[PDB]
A paper describes a structure:
Here we studied metal-preference evolution within the natural diversity of the iron/manganese superoxide dismutase (SodFM) family of reactive oxygen species scavengers. To study this process, we leveraged the existence of naturally Fe-specific, Mn-specific and flexible Fe/Mn-cambialistic SodFM homologues, which differentially utilize these metals to catalyse the detoxification of superoxide.
More cambialistic outliers included the Bacteroides fragilis (aCR 0.98) and Coprobacter fastidiosus (aCR 0.99) SodFM2s, which seem to have evolved higher Mn activity from their most likely Fe-preferring ancestor. We identified at least two independent emergences of cambialism in this group, once from Fe-[name] and a second time from Mn-SodFM1 ancestors. Next, we leveraged the cambialistic SODs from S. aureus and B. fragilis to investigate the specific role of the XD-2 position in determining metal preference. Therefore, our results suggest that the S. aureus cambialistic SodFM1 has potential for evolution towards higher Fe preference, whereas the B. fragilis cambialistic [name] has reached the highest possible level of Mn preference via mutagenesis of the XD-2 residue alone. Importantly, consistent with previous reports, comparison of four protein crystal structures of the WT and mutant SodFMs we determined here indicated that metal-preference modulation by XD-2 and Q/H occurs without any significant changes to the secondary metal coordination sphere within the resolution limits of the solved structures.
Author numbering:
A (entry chain B), B (entry chain A): 1 to 192
The structure:
């Protein structure tokens, strides 16, 4: 019932920022496994027939949450990138909210990089919006996603080692610095 | 105060099970960073003058515990391996305790592999002994180590992706299966 999300670009199209090798493993093996696992774990449970978002919003810690969170996180992650983005910062309401909540986009980038690099272990740095329009940076452990806390996820950096280890090894910060160049802000803006 | 532990073998000596590349990054970069961080974080705190082990036993969750736990974990990890072990299973008191508590060494291996593969995200599978001589398998998240719970750690498998990603990518189970052939049971026995 859960299917792989189609990439809007070729597996090597994010080069030189993310290698084809990383996309091949990260999308083709890790995300495939999360989808496979979710399909294996939901039969016989009331989570069968639920969207990944509904599961992430409701399930306690466990294998189903872990895999549904990872399916949601990776879907949002791969689909927020483009080979050659038209713009390299957000405009519109998101641009305005970033100014309001972080002072400037440049300062948001600093804070978001810091959260990404500071997360100990596996997880995700997320920029989300709450139901009243305020932005939040969160460190989501392991497979967690801000939907659990009732936030709407906008931009997610995967800092599981598999996201970067083939390209950057231990140098997480060097990886995170490069991601800005491939963010499709048109997609991110429309998550508000 | 905190120094890198001397490796008892050359960086390529665990080949073909663990590559030189993995030792170069895992020991030379990851463990170096954890030791560096502990040296940066501990001066001027209640932890100054304490051994790594004492810190792991006493510190609450936070950056000091994360780094001290990882120093302890990795120290025990590297020192429990040898290029060409004389035997491939424990004898003596350890051998007897494994039979007692797990039925056989083969069943211990099955349970330990299962704990290793089942740990979601970053962490460690640990075999430890309690005050009564009973053995336990624990899944320690992130930088945790059984010393916190007053258990004495005997054998630890690192299932952070950096431990295996360069050699096995996503195939953690295939990595864990190979570790058994480089365990130095002479060292592990003397931990009991
Ligand atoms: Fe990932
Ligand atoms: Fe490690």
């Amino acid at each position: 019932m859960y299917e792989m999300p189609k990439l809007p670009y070729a597996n090597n199209a994010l080069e030189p920022v993310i290698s084809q090798q990383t996309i091949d493993y990260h999308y083709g093996k890790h995300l495939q496994t999360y989808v496979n696992n979710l399909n294996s774990l939901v039969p016989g449970t009331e989570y069968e027939g639920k969207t990944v978002e509904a599961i992430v919003a409701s399930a306690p810690d466990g294998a189903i949450f872990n895999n549904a969170g990872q399916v949601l996180n990776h879907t949002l992650y791969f689909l927020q990138f483009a080979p050659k983005p038209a713009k390299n910062e957000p405009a519109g309401k998101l641009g305005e909210a970033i100014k309001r909540d972080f002072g400037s986009f440049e300062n948001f980038k600093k804070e978001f990089n810091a959260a990404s690099v500071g997360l100990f272990g596996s997880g995700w740095a997320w920029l989300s919006v709450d139901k009243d329009g305020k932005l939040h940076i969160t460190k989501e452990p392991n497979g967690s996603n801000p939907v659990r806390a009732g936030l709407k996820p906008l931009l997610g950096f995967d800092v599981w080692e598999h996201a970067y280890y083939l390209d950057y090894q231990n140098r997480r910060a060097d990886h995170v610095n490069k991601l800005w160049e491939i963010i499709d802000w048109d997609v991110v803006e429309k998550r508000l």
